[PDB]
PDB file of C-alpha atoms in Angstrom:
ATOM      1  CA  UNK H   1       0.000   0.000   0.000  1.00 46.12           C
ATOM      2  CA  UNK H   2       0.957   3.608  -0.558  1.00 44.63           C
ATOM      3  CA  UNK H   3      -0.638   6.534   1.234  1.00 49.18           C
ATOM      4  CA  UNK H   4      -0.248  10.254   1.092  1.00 50.81           C
ATOM      5  CA  UNK H   5       1.766  11.696   3.949  1.00 55.58           C
ATOM      6  CA  UNK H   6       1.909  14.832   6.062  1.00 50.83           C
ATOM      7  CA  UNK H   7       5.120  16.094   4.392  1.00 49.39           C
ATOM      8  CA  UNK H   8       5.741  16.289   0.644  1.00 47.90           C
ATOM      9  CA  UNK H   9       9.207  14.744   0.811  1.00 50.38           C
ATOM     10  CA  UNK H  10       8.146  11.655   2.840  1.00 51.15           C
ATOM     11  CA  UNK H  11       8.016   8.198   1.267  1.00 48.96           C
ATOM     12  CA  UNK H  12       4.474   7.164   0.606  1.00 48.84           C
ATOM     13  CA  UNK H  13       5.270   3.410   0.898  1.00 47.40           C
ATOM     14  CA  UNK H  14       3.517   1.816   3.899  1.00 49.53           C
ATOM     15  CA  UNK H  15       5.160  -0.738   6.176  1.00 46.79           C
ATOM     16  CA  UNK H  16       4.127  -4.324   5.292  1.00 47.08           C
ATOM     17  CA  UNK H  17       1.507  -4.622   7.861  1.00 48.36           C
ATOM     18  CA  UNK H  18      -0.248  -1.270   7.163  1.00 47.29           C
ATOM     19  CA  UNK H  19      -2.970  -1.313   4.469  1.00 48.02           C
ATOM     20  CA  UNK H  20      -5.188   1.560   5.595  1.00 46.13           C
ATOM     21  CA  UNK H  21      -4.567   5.225   4.712  1.00 46.49           C
ATOM     22  CA  UNK H  22      -5.782   7.936   6.985  1.00 49.03           C
ATOM     23  CA  UNK H  23      -6.355  11.627   7.303  1.00 48.60           C
ATOM     24  CA  UNK H  24      -6.585  12.945  10.883  1.00 49.01           C
ATOM     25  CA  UNK H  25      -7.855  16.560  11.408  1.00 50.37           C
ATOM     26  CA  UNK H  26      -8.241  18.568  14.592  1.00 46.95           C
ATOM     27  CA  UNK H  27      -8.246  22.150  15.803  1.00 45.86           C
ATOM     28  CA  UNK H  28      -5.730  24.074  17.819  1.00 46.14           C
ATOM     29  CA  UNK H  29      -5.910  27.640  19.077  1.00 45.68           C
ATOM     30  CA  UNK H  30      -5.367  28.939  15.514  1.00 46.82           C
ATOM     31  CA  UNK H  31      -7.980  26.697  13.886  1.00 46.77           C
ATOM     32  CA  UNK H  32     -10.435  29.362  12.684  1.00 45.20           C
ATOM     33  CA  UNK H  33      -7.693  31.678  11.409  1.00 47.13           C
ATOM     34  CA  UNK H  34      -5.073  29.277   9.938  1.00 46.29           C
ATOM     35  CA  UNK H  35      -7.063  26.092   9.309  1.00 45.29           C
ATOM     36  CA  UNK H  36      -7.410  22.649  10.733  1.00 42.77           C
ATOM     37  CA  UNK H  37      -4.280  20.723  11.744  1.00 43.16           C
ATOM     38  CA  UNK H  38      -3.752  17.589   9.580  1.00 44.30           C
ATOM     39  CA  UNK H  39      -1.782  14.374   9.693  1.00 44.06           C
ATOM     40  CA  UNK H  40      -1.731  11.854   6.841  1.00 43.93           C
ATOM     41  CA  UNK H  41      -0.355   8.329   6.947  1.00 42.53           C
ATOM     42  CA  UNK H  42      -0.585   4.547   6.859  1.00 43.97           C
ATOM     43  CA  UNK H  43      -1.968   2.299   9.642  1.00 43.27           C
ATOM     44  CA  UNK H  44      -2.807  -1.351  10.303  1.00 43.42           C
ATOM     45  CA  UNK H  45      -6.254  -0.312  11.450  1.00 44.49           C
ATOM     46  CA  UNK H  46      -8.244   2.968  11.201  1.00 44.90           C
ATOM     47  CA  UNK H  47      -6.913   5.059  14.107  1.00 46.51           C
ATOM     48  CA  UNK H  48      -9.053   5.626  17.190  1.00 46.63           C
ATOM     49  CA  UNK H  49      -8.903   9.281  17.951  1.00 47.68           C
ATOM     50  CA  UNK H  50      -9.778  11.490  20.874  1.00 49.58           C
ATOM     51  CA  UNK H  51     -12.863  13.561  21.177  1.00 45.68           C
ATOM     52  CA  UNK H  52     -12.751  16.607  18.906  1.00 43.96           C
ATOM     53  CA  UNK H  53     -10.426  14.811  16.391  1.00 45.44           C
ATOM     54  CA  UNK H  54     -11.875  13.665  13.035  1.00 45.91           C
ATOM     55  CA  UNK H  55     -10.473  10.626  11.268  1.00 49.01           C
ATOM     56  CA  UNK H  56     -10.953   9.499   7.643  1.00 49.91           C
ATOM     57  CA  UNK H  57      -9.843   5.949   6.663  1.00 51.95           C
ATOM     58  CA  UNK H  58      -9.637   4.220   3.299  1.00 50.89           C
ATOM     59  CA  UNK H  59      -7.734   1.186   1.928  1.00 53.71           C
ATOM     60  CA  UNK H  60      -6.799   1.899  -1.672  1.00 54.68           C
ATOM     61  CA  UNK H  61      -3.528   3.414  -2.809  1.00 54.82           C
ATOM     62  CA  UNK H  62      -3.191   7.092  -2.130  1.00 54.51           C
ATOM     63  CA  UNK H  63      -6.846   7.303  -1.234  1.00 53.87           C
ATOM     64  CA  UNK H  64      -6.212   9.913   1.503  1.00 51.18           C
TER      65      UNK H  64
ATOM     66  CA  UNK L   1     -24.970  12.681  20.552  1.00 53.02           C
ATOM     67  CA  UNK L   2     -26.840  13.917  17.468  1.00 54.21           C
ATOM     68  CA  UNK L   3     -25.642  13.223  13.889  1.00 56.50           C
ATOM     69  CA  UNK L   4     -26.678  13.951  10.417  1.00 57.89           C
ATOM     70  CA  UNK L   5     -28.623  11.076   8.766  1.00 61.91           C
ATOM     71  CA  UNK L   6     -29.132   9.770   5.208  1.00 63.93           C
ATOM     72  CA  UNK L   7     -32.907   9.850   5.072  1.00 66.56           C
ATOM     73  CA  UNK L   8     -35.632  12.419   6.032  1.00 66.89           C
ATOM     74  CA  UNK L   9     -37.459   9.744   8.152  1.00 67.58           C
ATOM     75  CA  UNK L  10     -34.507   9.166  10.532  1.00 68.39           C
ATOM     76  CA  UNK L  11     -34.228  11.120  13.877  1.00 67.12           C
ATOM     77  CA  UNK L  12     -30.855  12.976  14.350  1.00 68.30           C
ATOM     78  CA  UNK L  13     -30.681  11.763  17.921  1.00 68.70           C
ATOM     79  CA  UNK L  14     -28.341   8.907  18.402  1.00 68.63           C
ATOM     80  CA  UNK L  15     -29.129   5.850  20.418  1.00 67.18           C
ATOM     81  CA  UNK L  16     -27.483   5.956  23.891  1.00 70.71           C
ATOM     82  CA  UNK L  17     -23.939   4.623  23.766  1.00 68.86           C
ATOM     83  CA  UNK L  18     -23.472   5.749  20.131  1.00 68.53           C
ATOM     84  CA  UNK L  19     -21.293   8.814  20.381  1.00 71.14           C
ATOM     85  CA  UNK L  20     -19.612   8.683  16.935  1.00 72.99           C
ATOM     86  CA  UNK L  21     -21.029  10.290  13.849  1.00 72.77           C
ATOM     87  CA  UNK L  22     -19.922   8.903  10.473  1.00 70.01           C
ATOM     88  CA  UNK L  23     -19.844   9.636   6.802  1.00 70.13           C
ATOM     89  CA  UNK L  24     -19.483   6.521   4.675  1.00 70.15           C
ATOM     90  CA  UNK L  25     -18.746   7.076   0.933  1.00 70.34           C
ATOM     91  CA  UNK L  26     -18.170   4.892  -2.074  1.00 71.93           C
ATOM     92  CA  UNK L  27     -18.399   4.921  -5.811  1.00 71.97           C
ATOM     93  CA  UNK L  28     -21.058   3.346  -8.019  1.00 69.12           C
ATOM     94  CA  UNK L  29     -21.074   3.236 -11.821  1.00 72.02           C
ATOM     95  CA  UNK L  30     -21.774   6.940 -12.060  1.00 66.76           C
ATOM     96  CA  UNK L  31     -19.203   8.091  -9.614  1.00 69.80           C
ATOM     97  CA  UNK L  32     -16.815   9.992 -11.950  1.00 69.54           C
ATOM     98  CA  UNK L  33     -19.902  11.962 -13.205  1.00 66.55           C
ATOM     99  CA  UNK L  34     -22.384  12.302 -10.260  1.00 62.65           C
ATOM    100  CA  UNK L  35     -19.966  11.939  -7.351  1.00 61.73           C
ATOM    101  CA  UNK L  36     -19.970   9.476  -4.413  1.00 59.77           C
ATOM    102  CA  UNK L  37     -22.826   7.684  -2.778  1.00 58.58           C
ATOM    103  CA  UNK L  38     -23.157   8.568   0.915  1.00 57.66           C
ATOM    104  CA  UNK L  39     -24.511   7.223   4.117  1.00 56.35           C
ATOM    105  CA  UNK L  40     -24.628   9.279   7.289  1.00 58.50           C
ATOM    106  CA  UNK L  41     -25.320   8.038  10.781  1.00 60.38           C
ATOM    107  CA  UNK L  42     -24.475   7.296  14.393  1.00 58.41           C
ATOM    108  CA  UNK L  43     -22.311   4.468  15.688  1.00 58.92           C
ATOM    109  CA  UNK L  44     -20.628   3.256  18.907  1.00 58.62           C
ATOM    110  CA  UNK L  45     -17.257   2.823  17.127  1.00 60.08           C
ATOM    111  CA  UNK L  46     -16.109   4.014  13.733  1.00 61.15           C
ATOM    112  CA  UNK L  47     -17.506   1.526  11.147  1.00 62.92           C
ATOM    113  CA  UNK L  48     -14.879  -0.774   9.533  1.00 62.77           C
ATOM    114  CA  UNK L  49     -15.322  -0.671   5.785  1.00 64.24           C
ATOM    115  CA  UNK L  50     -13.958  -2.672   2.853  1.00 64.79           C
ATOM    116  CA  UNK L  51     -11.507  -1.559   0.172  1.00 66.64           C
ATOM    117  CA  UNK L  52     -13.241   0.918  -2.089  1.00 63.60           C
ATOM    118  CA  UNK L  53     -15.362   2.350   0.709  1.00 65.08           C
ATOM    119  CA  UNK L  54     -14.158   5.310   2.805  1.00 67.13           C
ATOM    120  CA  UNK L  55     -15.200   6.214   6.316  1.00 63.88           C
ATOM    121  CA  UNK L  56     -14.907   9.534   8.250  1.00 65.75           C
ATOM    122  CA  UNK L  57     -15.693   9.458  12.007  1.00 63.93           C
ATOM    123  CA  UNK L  58     -16.005  12.339  14.443  1.00 61.61           C
ATOM    124  CA  UNK L  59     -17.491  12.773  17.940  1.00 62.44           C
ATOM    125  CA  UNK L  60     -19.219  16.183  18.151  1.00 64.45           C
ATOM    126  CA  UNK L  61     -22.839  16.880  17.416  1.00 62.16           C
ATOM    127  CA  UNK L  62     -23.822  16.901  13.729  1.00 62.32           C
ATOM    128  CA  UNK L  63     -20.082  16.756  12.776  1.00 63.12           C
ATOM    129  CA  UNK L  64     -20.681  14.364   9.912  1.00 65.16           C
ATOM    130  CA  UNK L  65     -20.725  16.392   6.707  1.00 67.02           C
ATOM    131  CA  UNK L  66     -20.975  15.510   3.017  1.00 68.54           C
ATOM    132  CA  UNK L  67     -19.712  17.768   0.190  1.00 67.19           C
ATOM    133  CA  UNK L  68     -22.159  17.163  -2.651  1.00 65.04           C
ATOM    134  CA  UNK L  69     -21.062  18.361  -6.094  1.00 65.95           C
ATOM    135  CA  UNK L  70     -18.994  21.466  -6.717  1.00 65.35           C
ATOM    136  CA  UNK L  71     -18.408  24.354  -4.300  1.00 63.86           C
ATOM    137  CA  UNK L  72     -21.312  26.792  -4.213  1.00 64.31           C
TER     138      UNK L  72
END
């Protein structure tokens, strides 16, 4: 699997055991002014996230 | 918890113990033209979905959104 990542220079290749891509979004103190914080990666399973975090999971290449 | 729902006949109120709202999307035969199919609801945990189907989970009231079509 390949997934899009948080930084443009990162390898998109997932570790063997990670077939899900994800996009995690949340707000910080600057959320309304600068935008939502984001993290993109691979995972073995769709991440459980804290309250107030939003998580989008998919399992095709670069689907995030 | 309250969440957006797919059909007009569904109450927004979640069952007790279902604190997650979800947007589940996929493509049918018209996807490239008419965009994704969508289901919106409540759940106790974020639904696990098969390859080809995408799932977005959040845990605030009515947080489950769907962008139909082009920005307007």
